Amino acid sequence: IVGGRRARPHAWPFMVSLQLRGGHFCGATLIAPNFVMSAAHCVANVNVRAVRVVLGAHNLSRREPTRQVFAVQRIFENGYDPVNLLNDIVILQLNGSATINANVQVAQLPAQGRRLGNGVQCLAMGWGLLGRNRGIASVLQELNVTVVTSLCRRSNVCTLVRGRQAGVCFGDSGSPLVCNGLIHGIASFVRGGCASGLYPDAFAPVAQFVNWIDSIIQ
Ligand SMILES: CC(=O)C1=C(C)N(c2cccc(C(F)(F)F)c2)C(=O)N(CC(=O)O)[C@@H]1c1ccc(C#N)cc1
Ligand SMILES: *[C@@H]1O[C@H](CO[C@@H]2O[C@@H](C)[C@@H](O)[C@@H](O)[C@@H]2O)[C@@H](O)[C@H](O)[C@H]1NC(C)=O
Numbered sequence: 329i330v331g332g333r334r335a336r337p338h339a340w341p342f343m344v345s346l347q348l349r350g351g352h353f354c355g356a357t358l359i360a361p362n363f364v365m366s367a368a369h370c371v372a373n374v375n376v377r378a379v380r381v382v383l384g385a386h387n388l389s390r391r392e393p394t395r396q397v398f399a400v401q402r403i404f405e406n407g408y409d410p411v412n413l414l415n416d417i418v419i420l421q422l423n424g425s426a427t428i429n430a431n432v433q434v435a436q437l438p439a440q441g442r443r444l445g446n447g448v449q450c451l452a453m454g455w456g457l458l459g460r461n462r463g464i465a466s467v468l469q470e471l472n473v474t475v476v477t478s479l480c481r482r483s484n485v486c487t488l489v490r491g492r493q494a495g496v497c498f499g500d501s502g503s504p505l506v507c508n509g510l511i512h513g514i515a516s517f518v519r520g521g522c523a524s525g526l527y528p529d530a531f532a533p534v535a536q537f538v539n540w541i542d543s544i545i546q
């Protein structure tokens with residue numbers, strides 16, 4: 329997250345870090361005790377058997393007893409189309425069930441087909457890069473963003489920070505966009521580099537996928 333701020337610790341207990349050899353590479357969202365959802369581009373080409381699913385995290389550079397770690401049992405995809413930047417969602421079934429507590433909670437999803445109007449206020453978040461060269465992030469970041477339809481296709485929810493350069497960045501891939509208390513987005517792609525101040529950030533439109541999601545998690 330570029331130009332965002334540190335989250336209060338465990339403010340977003342559905343927020344997940346996906347990791348390889350102890351290094352974060354992508355965000356995800358706990359949507360049931362034994363399922364997370366993330367971006368399909370996070371796991372394309374990745375050794376899924378080596379992926380660790382980290383719940384209850386805040387500061388990645390610190391040892392944290394609030395943490396629970398799972399492996400991926402199964403992957404569910406929904407037509408990921410990287411050429412057209414479409415259907416950028418996967419569900420990873422875990423090898424066990426999360427222990428739901430103060431630091432680890434299941435996110436709430438919108439109704440199928442819910443649309444977001446121009447001007448909707450959302451929070452993006454993640455452990456992605458902090459700038460062009462500021463560094464990647466230890467502490468979970470969040471960011472106020474506004475839903476926009478200009479320079480956005482119907483097949484995305486897009487957001488733009490007004491009046492300054494800020495936005496999601498590398499490593500924020502697969503992280504939730506929260507709007508009106510619900511996970512409306514999964515960070516999918518940027519244009520013009522991170523925080524261009526021109527192109528909106530694009531997210532997989534979770535509302536479009538809810539019937540598919542419910543079929544899997546129930
Ligand atoms: C392949 C790859 O690694 C990409 C990353 C990481 N991000 C990217 C970069 C910074 C932030 C984010 C975030 F997800 F957070 F929005 C994403 C991009 O933008 N990309 C587009 C490209 O490289 O052409 C890639 C991409 C390609 C296809 C889809 C689809 N559908 C999604 C992303
Ligand atoms: C689920 O997996 C947990 C962590 O497994 C570890 O990470 C994966 C990616 C592999 O590299 C593996 O060798 C590691 O042990 C376990 O700690 C946990 O017990 C598992 N739960 C089960 C089997 O129900």
Ligand SMILES: *[C@@H]1O[C@H](CO[C@@H]2O[C@@H](C)[C@@H](O)[C@@H](O)[C@@H]2O)[C@@H](O)[C@H](O)[C@H]1NC(C)=O
Pocket residue numbers: 449450451472506507508509510
């Ligand atoms: C910045 O964001 C704050 C928190 O956002 C609210 O709660 C999150 C979890 C989402 O549900 C989001 O849709 C809500 O807006 C807001 O309280 C605050 O007012 C925002 N400030 C500005 C100026 O945008």
